[PDB]
Symmetry: D2
Subunit: 209 residues, 4 copies
């Protein structure tokens, strides 16, 4: 069965249902978006943000990439963060990793993957830093642990951006780390504690005028 | 409201997980064994274009990349890595590039306001604006936004087919590529005609196919 | 030891520092006060194209960026940051893009061997190969390398003039841009004619100059 | 006109070079075999071939603002891959310099447009070493951050499989230098890392055969 032609038919059925059951929603969204959440998650087909959050179109500004990696100088994630934080003024930035992330699993192996190798470098940087801890775990346990370390490192890379530090001080922007369990459907919050003195050093080092 | 949208979203997630356990208890545990999506979706980050919702599909159906204005920069590692993985490893049957009506990324490229880090990101849209300037200036402002959104999807399909991994999959298994526009006002997807002369793809094969 | 090129280079550095102190004792201390180069050079990393040597110039004269095959990716931060700094802050009067004969980067783009991380880097040369394929196929292999090297310089000058900082400097203070080919066999630089129809530069100004 | 003057000086240099090293340019035309890859600053005061007292063909060169190695940068990535795997250079040199205004800009808090994402790695080092940098004078902090940047660059360089392979297979060496723009001297940084550091890097980054 052609999944593309099947998807177009299901789109038309969904759009007609939306007109019947929430007739104001799509026309009000056409006037302009006002999402309160920026979601940075994995491209993994099992992590569709709006479905797993039980939300609607217009609720979640979304960036998805392999293993939800934030490269500090990546223009793709950089442009979405600039737009979502400065222009849409989202109240929340969520970084969501997930269980059974094959990107994280690839980083724990040493098989050459072409253009994927430079993309996964930040996961291999965390692997080197945390090697003794990761080697003490089973492969399945290491995949969860490195997925968590990657979310926490992402929150650090996110808060190293002046536009985020500005929004946190000016209008109480909040940032959050999650792990999605692909087997249960539950989001879990990471404790993601950093000393107060961590954000002070970051403000000094990264906030610009 | 007075409601924290983050804590409200976690509560709704638990309600959705409860519904999955009650109505389709096999689905999430079978997906945890491994994904097998047949579709790679490259679309806009715009909150109004959630691919799995608007396609009426489930988790596991759509491998997804979303960025500002669904732009494919040829040497971007972010889109590059997702295309390599989806095409070579997951062996998707379809790559969809979906633009949308009222794309403010496309609209920003038709303006000349300095937007900081967004300026280098939108360069491919300004390249299309320069190439098609006479055509775009002959339209109304709102028609030029729709037209540039279409040209951007078509240019994205060209950038996509400049990748050896995609040309190989098109030859080896008839991987298909599709250009769509999402109408944020109606919820309908429409297909772009997106024909290219045969001699276009032959020159591309010669110029970009790699061992 | 005596065959180590690195320890030999450090010894030659100390000999060069001694020569500077003996022959031009004011030069290095006056440069330490601040640089004022009038030229930004964008050239190939090729060991045969050291800009300051081949121009017969001194330290402080040439602000320099060198990469594989002197390629300007429009959204590359590495070349982007050097252009912003050289044009807006140092206020260079000249931006030079220098290609060269026997550029193996240009030759690699005319081949179809997979080269790992070099593949995405060379995409702009394969874009030119696809656009100019009939012309390149009508030439010998060696002539196609020279022609693609020239097209690459000219395309770089286009990418350079798509940047508002360059367009601003050209309009406000007569910044000039130049395309060169370095002949690695003779040591001579030759200028490329690099003329563009008037309507080309007007569309670029409209599409890329910031308000 | 500095540009037309430079083209005239080029022609004079090429004619002189045919007299003084009559066969050098012709040997160069048949191919290049440099033994050194130089990664340095774009600063007009740091021309590698001049300050090393070397000739064309001796130094494969990459220069960027503040000699920064972004791990997933294709520009520096492509030159390292080509120089190490194809030319088989014996030495990779990362050269920082005194009075580097790129390093100085990272110690400031002015917004600089497209320069901001480029300088993030220097601001990462500033945050990590902030107590040490704040304890120094302005001019001493610039020298210190320039040194930390070279050392961090050598770490990013050795996180690349192509470099780790060459070090193991053929004793490729990597070196950190600071160029003094006022004296003309290169000095070597001690750049010591525990043995356990390079073992974790090999485990985390070297691609399987
Ligand atoms: C090599 C590689 O990237 N493998 C992946 N496996 N799953 C991935 S996911 N969770 O990003 O879809 S990526
Ligand atoms: C400056 C800029 O990028 N503006 C945008 N407006 N909407 C965008 S969208 N459709 O990508 O959400 S981007
Ligand atoms: C594979 C590849 O890139 N080959 C090269 N040959 N010479 C180059 S040069 N002129 O940039 O040094 S690049
Ligand atoms: C803001 C900025 O980049 N300023 C610079 N000053 N000197 C530089 S150098 N040493 O790279 O030429 S960069
Ligand atoms: Zn994943
Ligand atoms: Zn959009
Ligand atoms: Zn070259
Ligand atoms: Zn410098």
């Amino acid at each position: 069965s052609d999944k593309f032609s099947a998807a177009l038919a299901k789109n038309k059925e969904w759009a007609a249902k939306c007109s019947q059951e929430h007739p104001e929603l799509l026309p009000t969204l056409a006037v302009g978006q006002h999402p309160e959440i920026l979601w940075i998650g994995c491209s993994d087909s099992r992590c569709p943000e709006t479905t797993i959050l039980g939300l609607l179109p217009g609720d979640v500004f979304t960036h998805r990439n392999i293993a939800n990696v934030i490269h500090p100088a990546d223009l793709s994630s950089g442009a979405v963060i600039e737009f979502a934080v400065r222009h849409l003024r989202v109240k929340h930035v969520v970084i969501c990793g997930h269980t059974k992330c094959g990107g994280v699993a690839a980083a724990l192996g040493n098989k050459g993957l072409g253009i994927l190798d430079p993309w996964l470098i930040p996961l291999r940087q965390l692997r080197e830093q945390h090697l003794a801890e990761l080697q003490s775990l089973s492969r399945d346990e290491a995949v969860v642990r490195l997925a968590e370390l990657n979310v926490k490192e992402g929150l650090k890379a996110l808060t190293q951006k002046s536009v985020v530090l500005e929004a946190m001080q000016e209008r109480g922007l909040q940032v959050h780390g999650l792990i999605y369990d692909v087997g249960s459907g539950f989001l879990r919050q990471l404790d993601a504690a950093e000393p107060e003195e961590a954000l002070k050093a970051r403000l000094t080092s990264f906030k610009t005028d």
